[PDB]
Symmetry: D2
Subunit: 325 residues, 4 copies
């Protein structure tokens, strides 16, 4: 079983831990976090977004017992002090965010870990991966620090990939309607629509390089707790109807992007996609086409759960290629 | 002074009443509503969206005393029973919504009112007006039932008019991010992003006829109390930069669309536009241009206050043309 | 297996159906609702509060296939037209609310059902039951129309019962802080704290008659989607400490009120009690005692899930006593 | 005119500045804040809670021009470096919160200010003042550092004072239902009811010393933007009815507590008290009495605006006693 450590216990770290503890192919050996075992067990068991954890979560002496398995707990702010060599850590998931991600990852390597998965794109990682888009690019012999991009990029890239490979993309603009996770952001008070910048369209370069200059956009932060939406207005290179666009997505969801992209013909609201494991769910009832070429596509994503499921999928892909190069 | 009655005391009726009671050029003679004077005075004085009313509001015997002036109160469900002939009502504002608006308006005419302003587009009105766009079309000798369109159309039409007259519009799609005012709408529970249909782009035909087939869109209802946003992605017929688009809006706001359209270079959030009297406020900091032609424009509007101010402006325009044909 | 029908498919009807379809001791033969099978299947599968249903939900010809079992669907507004005699319906759960509940129940009896469970107290039912408080009072030979009280009464009555039997209650006042489910209620706009009346303290008379005149209170509706709170300030007849009060609750939760009342020493928030099946969960960390006698107790309850679980428990209790009088 | 400086530009500092700039008896000479003049002018002009500022707000070179008057701007983190002696500052309002308030105040004294008003109780101030309760205690010759208590204490103390002086208070418990401004607080996500501690009942000792041991309580943080509520359950020393309690409050509001406490017989919601200048508004329709002695009283307060108005009232009281000892 691949041996994994998790650094940082924010929402992504906790969701990844929840999902990995259910994977019997993965052994979560250790956690490095800022809090005591009792606080960590509380945070694992209870969650205001995804509900209570199904398995038994129990705090012990500098460890957790989760689903019957022991997980060691550490509290090191300098990652190169961690006992990763002594624990034979195969993969560290670096879940403390964007800030100095590459330095932290190198710290984990210096501590004896073999590979690091970053949770942010464009940190000078050896390779940027979006599952369903370019995971084939991972070389276990050449790639040591691997990025899983971001949640919005994990939604945007498969959608855009389907569109470009079926119809060709001329150019497009997008709005990502973002749940909660710049004077505008600082004056929020959790009550307003807030326009901000987004980096998902630029991060698209890392996984679909032939497409930069073609897409850009902004974010609208809205006061919903979780679940976000990509609103993409894109011009295609060939004539389409809404039904043809939806059929391309429907076919990708059942084949090449199975488990990553899904397609829905149901009249759902954003809350219905809470704890959905897909990277993107096309809302088939809203697809629009103006003058056969200008296409509006709406894609739902749980900006926490889908990304964490992709992180676990990536752990499994990397581990398989580590044992069988 | 032009003599006005208001039918219906929902949020639009109450906001229009608040604004008209401040206009010394307008005499609000009467109100027809479903509640007693005490309840109406409560609803006039207090408002969870726009705050407490500034003037003294007092309930009397089947009347209100507001800002020192008496307003008669009626409770007729059939508008042709109203004493509009006996009160010399010049204009009735029909504020009970879209349902059977033309029948209600004819009822007010049969009761003796001279003109009716509907608060919804496409009700077979004699003319559809958006102030700043086509108010010149009103003929006091030929037009008896007049529509002020809708709040979203009052935002979209001036923006689109500036764009078309300065640069020409090829085609475009829009999202209106709507505050609160179909299985999706029924399953809301006030907590989700809800995609729905919108009729603002189609209602554009009534005030800018040369532009239909060129624009369509959808709505995203989000749980904010008030203030909404038009997110327009439009292709233009000539090369532009973001600065040139913003300068066109800035020039229209200070001249041809003064008081109707405004332009902001400040980093504001949606709540900062609460009780803003403009039909649309361009957010200059978010304007984007892809490949010199594909333009993203964001326009804020208080979907209640701006529309009600336009209703009062229209009352004044119609009354001026009634006295001086 | 006891044969059950459900009348009305609001949130309580749907939650009860979800829970009963999992109970292999209960056969849900039929549903009477206002919508078609496709809409009902949508509403069963998806829920903005409690998430997606775990089992396969599928719509057929005037029926549903849920978890592999067929459920017949009817659309009768007059309950005495229903084929309950032909289906051998043992128990009808009347889930259309308070309005004319007894008339509806009699209609179900006239249609051939043997017993009816109302979802509201004080409707001239033969007996009012709160599980854990007085279910022993049900007589299968004398009681035909049975009430499960209300969600707030199902929280308040076990708490008050523990307090009265351990320490004696002199008098008390309560506030129920209520999630969303009178000029104040009509002016809401989903954004305010709204004081209203509550009938839970009066409904206490029906299940704990020796206690009326001793308790009354009000409600504060707050804009949270689900999960509510009883804030009880009660004077006791003997000296206590906070620890003794909490120990009384802790002992009741593990014995006489097992499955109905629970006790928590964890620092949780309201959202952590979403889809909790208990009628009440004492928040042990907030219990307060002033001058040894005046006690503040806080009790969480999911105002939907706990009540629906109690409805299913009551179905099982009634059915057991029907087969073994 | 009394010369005032404001230290700290959080919400209380900004609201106090807004109110003081309207007072022609007060000269706001300077502000010490963490941001540039342009950012400060933005924050003064726009506010997501209380709306846009009425007066002209303009940023100049290390100054603001507000309502036509110039206000100097400083950016000193050490208050004893401020030029208060050179500006003849009479009163500094210390609006950076509870943390090290007395040290900051002494710093302002060392810089040359004559008096300091703290915005938190129990900081070893020379005197704690609640306007309407004990402002008579201020001695301009003996008191140099003055506390205006807290917003919740400014609501609780006048209510409790009326009750104790009219009927006598035996003991009581309270809940303060608090808008947004401990594992529970850290796991919020702005969506839950959160029980926390409150210090308002203990701070009552400072302004009504004969009453400690008699009152204590907790807070329930609820996701409303502004406006909070005190829910007080108190036993009195003499028999009362709800009408007598409400009449005591009504008489205090029109006499001894004019401008501080108000009384409402209207069915309002919390949002209707936004930007209300009173310290407390009794909700007369919810007052309850159990067994002639146990009284429930609900008191609304804008936890920002009322407190800031009290701060300005205190500035005026202190200045009057400074010039006329």
């Amino acid at each position: 079983k691949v041996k994994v450590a998790i650094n940082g216990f924010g929402r992504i770290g906790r969701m990844v831990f929840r999902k990995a503890m259910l994977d019997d192919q993965i052994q979560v050996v250790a956690i490095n976090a800022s809090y005591s075992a009792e606080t960590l067990a509380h945070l694992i068991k209870y969650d205001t977004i995804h509900g209570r954890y199904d398995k038994e979560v129990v705090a012990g002496e500098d460890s957790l017992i989760v689903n019957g398995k022991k997980v060691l707990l550490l509290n090191s702010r300098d990652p190169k002090q961690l006992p990763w060599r002594e624990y034979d850590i195969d993969i560290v998931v670096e879940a403390t965010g964007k800030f100095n991600a590459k330095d932290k990852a190198m710290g984990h390597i210096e501590a004896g870990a073999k590979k690091v998965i970053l949770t942010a794109p464009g940190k000078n990682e050896d390779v940027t991966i979006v599952m369903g888009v370019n995971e084939d690019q991972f070389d276990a012999e050449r790639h040591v620090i691997i990025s899983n991009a971001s949640c919005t990029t994990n939604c945007l890239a498969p959608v855009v990939k389907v569109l470009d490979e079926e119809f060709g993309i001329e150019s497009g603009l997008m709005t990502t309607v973002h749940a909660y996770t710049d004077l505008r952001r600082a004056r929020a008070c959790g009550e307003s629509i807030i326009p901000t910048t987004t980096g998902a369209a630029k991060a698209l370069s890392l996984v679909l390089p032939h497409l930069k200059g073609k897409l850009h956009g902004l974010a609208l932060r809205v006061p919903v707790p979780n679940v976000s939406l990509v609103d993409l207005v894109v011009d295609l290179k060939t004539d389409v109807t809404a039904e043809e666009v939806n059929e391309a997505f429907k076919r990708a969801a059942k084949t090449s992007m199975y488990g990553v992209l899904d397609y829905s013909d149901e009249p759902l609201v954003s809350t219905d996609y809470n704890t959905n494991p897909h990277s993107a769910v096309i809302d088939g009832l809203t697809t629009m086409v103006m003058e056969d070429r200008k296409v509006k596509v709406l894609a739902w994503y749980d900006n926490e759960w889908g990304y964490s499921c992709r992180v676990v999928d990536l752990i499994r892909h990397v581990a398989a290629r580590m044992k069988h190069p």
